[PDB]
Structures are given as structure tokens and as C-alpha cells.
Amino acid sequence: DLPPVAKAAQVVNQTLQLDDSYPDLDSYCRPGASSDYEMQSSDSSWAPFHVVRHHNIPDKVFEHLNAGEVFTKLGLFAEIGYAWASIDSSLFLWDYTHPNPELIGYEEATHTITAVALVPPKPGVFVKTITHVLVVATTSEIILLGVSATPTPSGSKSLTLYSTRMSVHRGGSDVSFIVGTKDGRIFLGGESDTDIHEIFYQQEERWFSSRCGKINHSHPFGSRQQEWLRGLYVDDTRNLLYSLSNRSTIRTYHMEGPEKLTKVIEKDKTSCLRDFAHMADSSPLFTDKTNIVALSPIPATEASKLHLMALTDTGCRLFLSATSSALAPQSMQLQFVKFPPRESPTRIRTLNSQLDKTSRALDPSALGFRFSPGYFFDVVRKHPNQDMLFVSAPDTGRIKVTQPASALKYFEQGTWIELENGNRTIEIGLTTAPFAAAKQPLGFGNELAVQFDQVPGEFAVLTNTGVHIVRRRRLVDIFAKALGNCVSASDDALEREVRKFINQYGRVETIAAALAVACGQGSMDRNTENLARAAFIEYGGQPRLAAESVRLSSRHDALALYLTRLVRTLWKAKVVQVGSGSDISSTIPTLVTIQENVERLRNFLEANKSTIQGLAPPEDIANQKEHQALHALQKLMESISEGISFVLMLFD
């Protein structure tokens, strides 16, 4: 009936739909609790994260730091690869990726600096060469500076500051927390009270207004109580702002209008504890003595219901839902708790089903960060001198293999990272582009689908001695390094190591990883690639008929899976964009890499036409339809290569 490249395109379409059906956060963090962890040694080939490099703080600021009289502070601009240090009324920026960095200083400030942040500019205010706005809060003023982080030319973004003649009186309320929205709104808060302030700024000079203003969105009357803020948090996908107080009160504000901000929820610790009590499992790790030390908003693209994660100082992660009564939310509820892991960090390896709700391995948690799709960093301050870093990620493999929906739990992969003693962690920021496998909760967290489209997540960890770089490790990275441990090792040692992957990720995912590593994906490298190739052959399975109808081998599914993931960004995409005669949808450099990747795959198939079962010509119906399906896939590849080669020719 159907021609070859058409049958293959059907498999690709179905495969795309499979990856985009990866469970959403709401469905494996259902009401209840979990303590599901598989811990991994930091040096293991299975480690979910690892340190990749460290950048020492340049000596010229160590001199300035000791020249400090009253106040000093450090901070991170991880999205452009810059760090900063303030000493009293002086500020210093530098690129930490650079080996002998120049200091970009700003010493115009008259009073002590208390907070600085890097925020998007308001549209239609500045010239287009200004990528960001630098907000500098002192005890006297809030100062705005123009910033251009344009990429001249090799490592980090060359950085220049511009004065703006925009400054507001600081007022009576301290500023320690500055956050910005997508559209350049600037919100402020601090340690004097719970009030949230916003800075407006304009292009024009008007007689009745000013270029630069500051208003208080909170307005309290008389009758106050001592309470101040611990952090401010923006969620642009829902136009929400969250504050966290010292009493562990969580307040939610809605940006209903372009200049309006409205408190719509106030949830104190008591409410969280009442919610927690009505859960089937209470615990000594969460009481009225416990503090919430950090929040991390969850975007609407990752989950519909779960809005927010809160970290306790005992290491519990609280996941809170929020619903409208009908839009802004009006209610917030503690639904799900992820309790701490049990294993503590050790020097010597140690010998490895009920809910563990009493672990103290994360007690005390001083700092905490969550990044999509669930990368968790916890700064555990067990000793007053050195921090231990607990880092976990969703066990994506087991999560997507799990069946049925009711069996879904929040499975995780974790590890402890020790940055050598005596240095305190200050901040942790994302250096790469925000993760997202899909545009809706379903399919959003599928790391497996994007391990060849996206750079693995990298994270800058700022301490008082330097910036450490932590990188997420993908399936292919783990599979490659594990094979690296099988080179010198035995024959039936590979079979052993492969079965570990199969029991976790599933046969198809495992073989797809072997294929990828055989094609040069992955973190002697030739021995590893040959080993991956061997696994792809010996463990790929075979076609069989069910109960006419045939079930293809895992080797075939693996191939369709790998090919699909290489072209997933452009498959359903329009080839061009038209405004009146113009653009190409997918960039020129990405089409080249996609092409190179596909041609690598094709090459691997030809270079092993003889030994790959089903490639050479051929119980029978099984092996024959296996042969037909593989042929169809190969005709699609050369068609993909031709097609891309054609579009590159068009815009040439």
C-alpha cells in the first residue's frame, strides 16, 4: 500500500507522540509523599551531576574585600557568565570564564550597597544595544545603569555600563532582594518589613511626573508586627510574584495589569502544618519550630496545579498547589512532600520500600534551588566550616518506563558533591538556556528526547573562593563512561553492565543509547564506541509475530527513536517564515548540525551492513518485515539529508 519513506514517517510521527507523552509533574507528584532515591557516589559513572571546572576569584578583589570597613557582598550573573562583589559604596563586576579578567568597577555610589541585580530592560526605553539593566540599591538610593553584554568574541559577553540619570530615594525600607520580570518590571523587598516596592522608569521628561519613580504595592495601616522578607520570586508564565518571610509566610501577588500588583494569597506556616497534618503521614521533620528557607516557582509549562516548591531547613521539599475559585489564584495548598534521602556522604563506598520520613541527612539546609525539570541543589551546612552539596534529578528513565499511571512515583537520582572545605556556598545560578522538552506539562520533563538538541544544563556555584561549574549528565554520558569501565574488563561483564541499564531505562532506551555512543555522541574513545556497537548488535533482540502482525526488534525501535530525536525540532516546523519575502524558520547552523548527525547515523549503518541483523537481505515474515522496516528508515534518512541539503541551497 504505502511507499517506504511514508511508512517511516508514520513511525516518526508516532515516536514523536510517545516522547511528548512523558508524564507531567502533577501526575508523579500526586497528593501524598515520597522518599524514593537511588544514590550515586560522586565519582561513579552513574553520577547524575559532576563538577567540570572551577574559576578562582581574581586576586584584585580579594585585596578590595580586605580593604572593606563595614560591608561586603558577593553575587552571580550566571546567565551572562559574570560575578560581582560590592565593598561598601563600591561595586566590581568580572567575567569568571576569563582567566585574567579585567575589573569593571562602579564607584559613583555614595552609600553602602545592599543589593544588586541584572534585569531585562523595559521595551522602547533604550537603544537596542542594551541587553540588560543593572539595579544597584544602596542605603540611600536605587540606581539604574544600562548594560550591554554583547558577545565579543570568543568566551563570555564583553560588558559595558551606561549611566541613565535614573535614581530614586531608597526610603525607609531596606532593599536586599531585587527581581525582574520578562517585560522589565522591577520589584524590591528587604529586611525591614514585608512590603513590596516597584520601580517605574520612563523615556520622556514630563512636567507632572518623573523619569524614574518608586511605589509601595502593599500599604499597611497601623497595628504592625515584626516580620521581614527572605526572598522574592517571579513566575512570568502566570504573572505571579512570591515573597517568603522570616516567619516562613508565603505571600502570592498577581500582576493583573502592566503597573498593578495585588496580594491574592497569604499562607503562614500554621496553614502549611494543618495541611501537612491532614496528610496520611506526619513527621518530626516538619513542625512549628521548622523554617522554610527557600522557594522555587514552578512554571505553568511544567505543571498546571503545582505552583511552588518550598524547602525546609530539615531538607523537606513541599510542593504547593494553587487554584482559582473560578485569572489569579485565591487558594494555596500543601499537596505533596518529598522527604530527604538517607545516605550521607562517605569517603569509602558502603553497602547500599516504606516511606522514609525521618532522615536527617539534609539537616540543616541553609540554601536551596530548583531548576526545571526538577534539578535540585541543597546546601547542607552540617558543620560550621564546610558545606556539602546534595544534588538530585528526576529519574527520567524510570519515570517514562513506569506503567500504569497509578504506579508513578517521584523517582530520583542523587549524589553528594564536596567542594573542598573551608568555602561557603553563596549562590547557584543557571548558565545555560532554561530546560524545556515541550510547551505543555505533558512531555515537558523528557530529558531523553532532548539530549542531542539541547546543551546539558550547566550550573555556576558561587563560593567565597570561586565559581564551580556543575554539569548535568545525560543517559548517553552515563552509558559511555560505564562502557569505558568494560574495556579491560571481561566479556560477560558487559552483559552485566548493560542489564543495569535495561532494568532501569528499558531495552529500547538502552539500545538507543548504545547506537548514539557508537555514532560519537557521549561526554580510549574508539574502544568505547566499538563496545557500544557490540551492545547494539548482541542485545538488540529480534523481530517476532504476535497474536498478520509482527513485533519489530528493539534494535529497530532504537533506530527510529534515535533518528526521531535528531529531527524533532524541525519535523513539524514550517520550512520558511514570510512577512513579505524573507526568513528561514530553523537557523542555518542548526540545520548543518542536524544534517551532520543524520549523516553520521547513515554512515554507521553502511559501515556495518554485514553485521547488523536485518540490514543485509534475509520466522521469515518476521525477519522480512524487519528488513522492510529498516529499509524504510534508511530511505527516510537520505531523504532527510537531501531535504536539508535543499533548504540550505535555497537560502544560499
Binding site: 563586576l93 579585567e102 575589573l103 569593571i104 568597577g105 562602579y106 564607584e107 522602547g124 526605553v125 533604550f126 537603544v127 537596542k128 544595544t129 542594551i130 545603569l145 544600562g146 559595558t160 555600563l161 551606561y162 549611566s163 541613565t164 540619570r165 523615556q203
Partner: peptide, 14 residues
């Protein structure tokens, strides 16, 4: 070295 602060004229349009 004190960072050179380029003018507002370039910064904001038009």
C-alpha cells in the same frame, strides 16, 4: 579602572 559609562543619548531612543 573605573568603567567608562557611555552616555544616555546612545542608551535610550529615539
Amino acid at each position: 579602572r573605573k568603567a567608562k559609562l557611555l552616555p544616555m543619548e546612545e542608551a535610550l531612543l529615539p
